[PDB]
């Protein structure tokens, strides 16, 4: 439109991105819609976005039911939001993720209409209580979501919004299936008795039973605990799932020896075709360090792309100093693909499992 202000053109005559502090009126050539009142972001503290994959799917069905309405046959659809920089970032980022995952656009095609816009969009911050000192941009998220789709990590056609919203709730386990190989959840809690009552599944609450039932029917082979003991590990071992402790302090960064042992522990489980379930207290901070390092080690994500992809599936991962830590150690993660390899001898540190060794240790084994 000619008389429209603060509106961005994506597809000429079809798709537009606006931002107004008022409700615009539809015309014979235009139709406006917003999803702020129904599709919003839940804040841990001072984080505001971006919108997760469940928000995109709900946005897609509303976008499609407006595109194919015969009343809007020859109109240009204008998706808009409020004038705040925070709400303009979530709307623009979600619209870009739509063209990436549904319309098969490239990052440089969806980032051109949003470049050098005045006023600029508000960069995304972490979900910690301290002052922000690290930001990811829409360029980081778009590239991260696009790279995950190219590697087969995201397929919106097999996506089930029903279970995605169900298992994110606290009373159902509080977890998300990040990749076909990994699951991030919060530490289960229980009051383990010390008598004959500790032999029946009656003291286990609903979120614990939901986790045990989901893991037993989804090929989960390993559970990695990163926080202190809040439950008894025998409940995971009774259903034939290995349990391993790699505990370090909440909010801190893991030592590289712990990260190497994690990569080795998860790589063989992937070699056996199973999934790995990692958790700390909330499954955001400490869980994001290890799973994020393995993703960079495998598919070559940048640190910024990796953080943006994790939050697009599970908001709030990688908190505080862990952001700069993942940023400064991303080279070491990708380096392990060329300086290390899977060992032939198991290790007691990862529970009789195969770790990473140098190329000198590996060739010396196959020779002997």
């Amino acid at each position: 439109s000619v008389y429209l202000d603060n509106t961005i053109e994506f597809l000429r005559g079809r798709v537009y991105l606006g931002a107004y502090d008022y409700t615009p009126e539809d015309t014979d050539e235009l139709v406006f819609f917003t999803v702020e009142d129904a599709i919003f972001y839940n804040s841990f503290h001072l984080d505001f976005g971006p919108m997760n994959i469940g928000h995109l799917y709900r946005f897609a069905v509303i976008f499609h039911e407006i595109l194919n309405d015969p009343e809007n046959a020859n109109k240009a659809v204008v998706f808009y939001s409020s004038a705040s920089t925070r709400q303009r970032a979530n709307a623009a980022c979600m619209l870009c993720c739509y063209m990436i995952l549904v319309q098969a656009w490239t990052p440089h095609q969806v980032l051109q209409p949003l470049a050098q816009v005045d006023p600029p969009f508000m960069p995304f911050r972490d979900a910690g209580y301290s002052n922000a000192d690290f930001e990811i941009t829409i360029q980081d998220v778009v590239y991260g979501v696009w790279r995950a789709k190219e590697k087969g990590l995201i397929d919106l056609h097999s996506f089930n919004l029903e279970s995605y919203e169900k298992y994110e709730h606290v009373e159902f386990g509080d977890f998300n299936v990040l990749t076909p190989d990994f699951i991030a959840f919060a530490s289960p809690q229980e009051d383990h008795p010390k008598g004959y009552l500790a032999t029946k599944s009656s003291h286990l609450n609903q979120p614990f039973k939901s986790v045990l039932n989901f893991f037993a029917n989804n090929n989960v082979q390993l559970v990695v605990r990163l926080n202190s003991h809040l439950y008894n590990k025998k409940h995971f071992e009774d259903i034939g799932i290995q349990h391993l402790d790699l505990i370090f302090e909440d909010g801190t960064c893991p030592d590289l020896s712990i990260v190497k042992n994690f990569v080795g522990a998860a790589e063989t489980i992937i070699k056996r075709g199973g999934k790995i379930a990692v958790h700390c207290k909330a499954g955001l901070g400490r869980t994001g360090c290890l799973i994020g390092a393995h993703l960079i080690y495998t598919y070559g994500f940048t640190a910024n792309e990796c953080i943006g992809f994790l939050r697009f599936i599970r908001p709030g991962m990688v908190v505080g100093p862990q952001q700069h830590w993942l940023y400064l150690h991303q080279n070491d993660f990708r380096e392990w693909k060329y300086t290390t390899r899977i060992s032939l001898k198991p290790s007691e540190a990862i529970g009789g499992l195969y770790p990473l060794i140098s190329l000198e240790e590996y060739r010396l084994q196959k020779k002997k």
């Binding site: 597809l11 079809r14 798709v15 499609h64 194919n68 549904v102």
Partner: peptide
């Protein structure tokens, strides 16, 4: 997923 995906490809 979908069954009514509009043709919004990049020109």
């Amino acid at each position: 997923a979908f069954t009514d995906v509009p043709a919004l490809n990049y020109p």
